[PDB]
């Protein structure tokens, strides 16, 4: 059977031996990468693309750098190469990906996480709340999902404040502090990056909004790597993490290889061709009337070993198994819930201190 | 010995590269440069976006640039905005008028010496108050740009009112169903926001439905009186042209003067850190990047070549000047100017679709 070249890019420390466990067959190449700046990522993927006929990329990293997703989307869109953000900063949710993107992520959408957050609140009857976001993309999608959910519900929801903080400017005028001081709600939903949340919490503490009587609920990208807990994160912080526990990295890489291979097999089986992988990033301008996004109809609908590995048109996982986590007094993230097939199951009936 | 502070630029040609080098030299000449001294680092546009992003790293971020000037070539400023944005290095757009660059989520450290197309609503609104057009019809393309003009005009109106807003799919050739809706309405002042090729479709459909003659007013922007849009444009139309909008030489001159002033104001403060030296291995932002943005955002340069330079809440140029253009006997005739805040009519009489309303 024909062979499709698949590059598996691993950033940081990982067990390559553990990781190493249709019409078309994959020729997998595990690639190690030390740096995650734009030049390093662009250069690595472009060098690999010229050395081998690379049909698709499986990317995994150990960082909390949500910018990796953005760098990858840009590469994916410019070169018309499927790229899967399966772990780390590469799987940190990228709202409004390019039209020409073939970038897909293992993780929940902003809208699904916002939904899970409200499911947690309904459980403990936390109907009075406020929202805080930065300009980080997806903030509009977050506020909108909350608003539309709350609007179309026979529940006593009360959204007291919605704050938008400008993290692109310095805080010499203490605008954030003056904005945060307006918060009165016992529950605060925060949408921003992990680096942004460290600052926000430092300030919110100075104004005394982090203690008991103030509960902060945050998305997956804020908690990020559960083994990296910024000192400024408040005790009793609730987050909606993607299951780094049960859905381990060797399984993700396997699934990522299956998606690219199945998609390729499916397109070859239906059109008697698959797109010829570009040998250059440096020719993308002249050779684009000959390139398409066509493989996306297939990459979005892959089922493997009775597991629906399908993605949304927006490039996020369709049915993830989410974990509800709580930052305890020993400053470690503790599992306190599970999100299944649109069902929430918590550990506690009475939320503890 | 002073501290050498680099300024970057992505310009059209070697002529423009030389103009930038001269503007930095003049900045060093006019300012007190015992403490800090500017150095021009520049390149021309690369053939594609990946190549451009790599050039920003290799050629400019490698030189610890404090800001990057960007023009449109002879391929957009986006890979530059993204690369510089990663580090929070400010980008100064010299000629891009697309409203998308006003979006802080996407274009994080971006300012421009030219306003977005959507800001033409500021001129239409002043034109509306002047000629007493209290009831208007707004026709916009259903793209970002079209919606940006509609939001901006709506903001100003909320006196004169937009009786209805009509949106069309970009690329539609038959707009007779859309224009039939507008014809039924009492209002006879039609404002258009469309690209060059989409405006052509409007004009052709409008003319067939006999809406380009006496009784109607057509108030349009720059894009809708350019290239092909002009071939089929009705006589009597009122459009706009941003004075010096395409003069890369004038915008380099003004952007350098603004940046030079802001650098010196920045070094009056304490704990000013240097930008990263190159991209490789550097994933943290420039800690002074956000402070430098705030200093730039609030910079005023009154004696600019392109007028009074000030930036708004999105870092878009304020006090921009426009030529009020009128199509008379198939010729664009300047009938007035929008000086930055006021309409000044010249001695050339306006000819409306047909005669004088
Ligand atoms: C775009 O076009 C506008 C409109 O003309 C210009 O704005 C005017 O600029 C002039 C010149 O700077 C200003 O004139 C000064 O007005 C003072 C009084 O102003 C009041 O009254 C006027 C008229 O009702 C109002 O518009 C205004 O709001 C005030 O309430 C006078 O006291 C000044 O005279 C003194 O200074 C001049 C020099 O400036 C001397 O020659 C005199 O001898 C005297 O000492 C002067 O006439 C005017 O106020 C501005 N008008 C508005 C509406 O703001 C913009 O300058 C122009 N922009 C560009 C980029 O060119
Ligand atoms: C502007 C921010 C991001 O949108 C954001 C972060 C925090 C916010 O508060 C708001 C927005 N991005 C832009 C793209 C950068 C990566 C990159 C580099 C080179 C090529 C393509 C892409 C990473 C930083
Ligand atoms: C990455 O770092 C390790 C450190 O042990 C080194 O062995 C490896 O060669 C480096 N990567 C590259 C591309 O040189
Ligand atoms: C997804 O996959 C199955 C594979 O058998 C296919 O038949 C089905 O039509 C696809 N679904 C959609 C909605 O495209
Ligand atoms: C462009 O601007 C410069 C001012 O820096 C000026 O010398 C030149 O004549 C202008 N050109 C046009 C076409 O207006
Ligand atoms: Na801006």
Numbering used by the authors:
A (entry chain B): 32 to 52, 62 to 393
B (entry chain A): 23 to 96, 102 to 185, 209 to 407
Paper passage:
N-methyl-d-aspartate receptors (NMDARs) are ionotropic glutamate receptors widely expressed in the central nervous system that mediate excitatory postsynaptic signaling. NMDARs are heterotetramers usually associating two GluN1 and two GluN2 subunits. The NTDs endow NMDARs with a unique capacity for allosteric modulation, harboring several binding sites for small molecule ligands that act as subunit-specific allosteric modulators of ion channel activity. Crystal structures recently established the existence of a "phenylethanolamine binding site" at a dimer interface between GluN1 and GluN2B NTDs.
We solved a cocrystal structure of the NTD heterodimer complex with ifenprodil at a 2.8-Å resolution, and then, using a back-soaking protocol, determined the structures of the complexes with MK-22 and EVT-101 at a 3.0- and 2.8-Å resolution, respectively. One end of this site, which nestles the benzylpiperidine moiety of the ifenprodil molecule, is buried in the hydrophobic interface of the upper lobes of the GluN1 and GluN2B NTDs, capped by F114, I82 (GluN2B), and A75, P106 (GluN1). The other end, hosting the phenol moiety, is partially exposed to solvent and makes both polar and hydrophobic interactions with the receptor. Thus, the distal hydroxyl group of the phenol moiety interacts with E236 from the lower lobe of GluN2B, whereas the aromatic ring interacts with a cluster of hydrophobic residues, including GluN1-L135, GluN2B-F176, and GluN2B-P177. In contrast, the GluN1-L135 side chain engages multiple atomic contacts with the ifenprodil molecule, but points away from EVT-101. In particular, mutation GluN1-L135W was found to be highly specific for ifenprodil, decreasing sensitivity to this ligand but not to EVT-101 (5.9-fold versus 0.7-fold change in IC50, respectively). We believe these results indicate that the incorporation of a bulky histidine or tryptophan disrupts ifenprodil binding because of steric clashes.
